[model samples]
Target: NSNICEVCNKWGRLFCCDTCPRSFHEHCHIPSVEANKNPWSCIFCRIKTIQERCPESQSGHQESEVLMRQMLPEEQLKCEFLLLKVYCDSKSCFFASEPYYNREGSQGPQKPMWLNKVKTSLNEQMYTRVEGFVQDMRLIFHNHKEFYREDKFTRLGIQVQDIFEKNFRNIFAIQETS
Candidate 1:
């Protein structure tokens, strides 16, 4: 059965580009169609066409060829968890450890004699603040689909660091672990 190029309407055996998968006739290619050839690269494949080709490139000149490649959706989700883990381990951020209150200020037997009350309070406060900030981040990502993109995620990392510095300014008293 004869086939035609959807674009040029030239007659030949039905064929498709291996790279872009666009349908074309064998004769529509720069090289004349070879009837004996079982498989062949289409016009798009001849030029190594990829998904990166600008949608507007077919006219004459392409505007921009910047293609957006991204990790798998599952990988992106996993990265969010990894980011959270890193944030939790940062000495100057959410993970900064505060003094344990059981080690200070209380002398009563039933009271936390081993715990310093002042340190414990500070720790609890820091924990509360960090938790709230993390929750806010989670909400931001969950609620905004656009923010889930890699570029947006990169921006979020910067914003989170800025917020960490501002929010925990003096409360981040833990020594750098490494």
Candidate 2:
């Protein structure tokens, strides 16, 4: 009926999300389900229905909506990355370049709170293959090519930049046509 259990990290028997592909053990589901809750919707389904609907779930036209809904999650996240960077520049946060150290002064990479919020909202790399970040990283390299040098920037930054540039325009195209 269900699937793998995230709780014990072992696969035996588990309940899965109807709306998304998440599985959890009885001991794992948050707050634990009531004994006779009747119908159990996965948290994603429950939140999307009850909370302010995410943009993807909103009413829209045919293929546009289809693309929004059906595209790989990371692709959608990449689109969002483009929107946030190219269009929403005035309201954007900063990304850190590779660091020898951060707040810990060589202990770890430096990450600010607002940057963290952006990362979480992007949720691109937490699980999915959010290649959008790759574009952003490319841009970062472009902005600092003098320092990172030709070796690192050769194909990595250029190709990613080209893709992200196209993606940036796609966001506008969708906005214009939609």
Candidate 3:
């Protein structure tokens, strides 16, 4: 009794060829499995072999898209957050050191007068610098609205900036130690 191909049920043929374990219709085989009697293979197997041997097919385009997503302003904001955190930490003095104050008390009489003036100037300078940074960040967002759209790239920037602002406000509320 002859077996029939499962895909193309034809008598006198097996469910699948000896070489190709995958069952297929005899007529469905690319070169007509019946014509090539020297141990046949299914079309699926041939395609799979070709794919494995092709190096170009292995390289995907999704990686480039992922990379582009990461280089957006949002990613930079996260990096800035880390830097700001370090700067605000006690170890960095939050850049609040009063350089004009005398530690040795050498200028005992004039020290207070000089310190008062210096403190005022430094406070103004610090305020100006902080304002400038904030202004620049706002401008960046304004000019790059498209980049800051609902995409991941823009969302990241928004999230980082929001967190940074909250942290900054909290820090401002606390009293500074000498």
Candidate 4:
């Protein structure tokens, strides 16, 4: 029996996956499960189901519709994995840490964004649509580039953004956009 929540590492009444040791809070998993009387698997245990649902399409509209719709269980797992990859790539913690306040009267992001904020929002199910989560993921780098210009932080932001985009394409099975 898994005692700690895999997503946030908090302890509470948890839902344990039948196939794996991972446990999650009721709201932590996508499309939160109710009544685990039946065999229940965590998102990690059912990733193939998520990927199998990815529809192939050449039309941007098709992809848009998929993302714009209310978050699907597959989409939620994809977003969670995408965020985890970004967090892994962002080892420098520059994006996760609070922004520097040394720049006085600088042309920077009016509203800054951070990686942990995105993680928190995901954990809290604040995003109703997949696009909202995508926008915020991009915003972290956008804010970094804006605040730091072409500095090392900006370069790191670009690197992490590249990692995000690459995994995003694979996870969602979406074609690359220019």
Candidate 5:
């Protein structure tokens, strides 16, 4: 009963994840959520479902070496899907829009990274390999944590980052590197 929405980090009617400590607002979740659904699991806890839905068939490698190499057809699809998931998890288009730079004044990083920027880079074929895309995705979170320390947005970023990492593993069939 003491949980805050993992997405907005606000007090409200929330959906609790059965498999993790996360709780989310109904509209905050990608595809949204309904209270009628029992035994709900958060996105991070639904890796098996994601894996089943993945179109790519290869069991992914744990090493970063392959990601550093050429991007395959399947790898491209995986990266695209990963970016979409990040956008979906970003509630109210917060991570998609570049309004923060104006809203917070000129006290933050000059070059901020967001989900949409990552998608743009992906679409423009800026990445020569999967590793570049991965690095960009990571940079978004790194920039986020640095910009909003001890804030609710920071918590949201942490949850979304965890979601990204778990799905990155499931979609790529990547095992634990550690």
Candidate 6:
């Protein structure tokens, strides 16, 4: 449990945690940790803790390991997607005009069908989680000037968010017609 650093997977120059099976290098950790004066935890645990803190749609939403970790990366990616969407929306993007049909890609009915490939991978639950992540991100970026895209641009969620928001329309829309 206290051999290799989780960050870099090196043998030496590592700090191990007292409570968990995690370790980190001084340079490779997520928080960039150094001296191990206290019982230090690796970044993986920190991200897990942060992820577990996300508010669920209902309550008592427990997940199996595969189910749990399945959407973690998507949640993170959704945030990045939101940021770009915000940035693009700032410029009045072409897709912003007509969401249902002309969202992204091509037109002419049969040229392209998928609105966006990113949201195609997410289920209704992940979509909801990503939206919740946005809410959390709103607070996480509340103090920042440049990161505050929580205005009307991100109001309903990703169009992807709303695509995510209503599991019925866009979800089936992507599936049945794509």
Which of candidates 2 and 4 reaches a greater lDDT?
A: 4
Q: List the residue pairs that clash in candidate 2.
A: none
Per-residue alpha-carbon lDDT of model 5 for 1-178, expressed as tens digits? 3388765568788878877887778765543565576788666566445566764644657547657866665566567667656655645265676636433532576667776677667667788898888887777777777778666777767777888888777667676555
Give one digit per residue, the lDDT tens place, for model 3 in 1-178.
2255443345554446565555545433333355555666554454445446764543433422322333233323322332243233332231223223233423322222222232233334432333333443443333333433554554544544454445544322222233
Q: What is the lDDT of residue 178 in candidate 5?
A: 52
Task: Supply the global lDDT for candidate 3.
Answer: 0.38
Best by TM-score: 4
Ranking according to lDDT, highest score first: 4, 5, 2, 6, 3, 1
Residue-level lDDT of model 6, residues 1-178, one tens digit each, is 7687653356887777665776656644433464644766554554445446763422332222212333465345434334333322223232323234332333333222222322232323344444443343333222222222444644333444333223322211222322
Predicted structure with the largest lDDT when compared to the true one: 4
lDDT at 41, model 4: 76
Tell me, what's the RMSD of every candidate?
A: 24.3, 12.3, 29.9, 5.3, 8.4, 15.9
Off by over 4 Å in 5: 1-60, 90-92, 102-106
Residue 169 CA error for candidate 3 (Å)?
A: 52
Clashing residue pairs, backbone N/CA/C < 3 A, model 6: 158-161
| Model 4 residue 178 CA deviation in Å | 7.9
Off by over 4 Å in 4: 1-44, 52-63, 90-92, 176-178
Deviating ranges (above 4 Å) for candidate 1: 1-4, 9-13, 49-178
Q: Write the per-residue lDDT of candidate 1 for residues 1-178, one digit (tens) a residue.
A: 2255644556656666544555555433333344565565543343323223443323332112111113333223222222322333232131222212232333222222111222233324432333433343343323322323353433544554554433332222223232
Which regions in candidate 2 have their CA more than 4 angstroms from the true location? 1-98, 101-139, 174-178
Reference-based TM-score of each model: 0.21, 0.28, 0.25, 0.66, 0.60, 0.30
For 34-141, candidate 2 gives per-residue lDDT tens digits of 365546664445534532545553333343333434336435443444533332232222332232322222233133223233344454333233343433444453
Task: Flag regions of model 3 displaced more than 4 Å.
Answer: 1-12, 60-178
lDDT computed for candidate 1: 0.35
In model 5, the Cα lDDT at residue 125 comes to 70
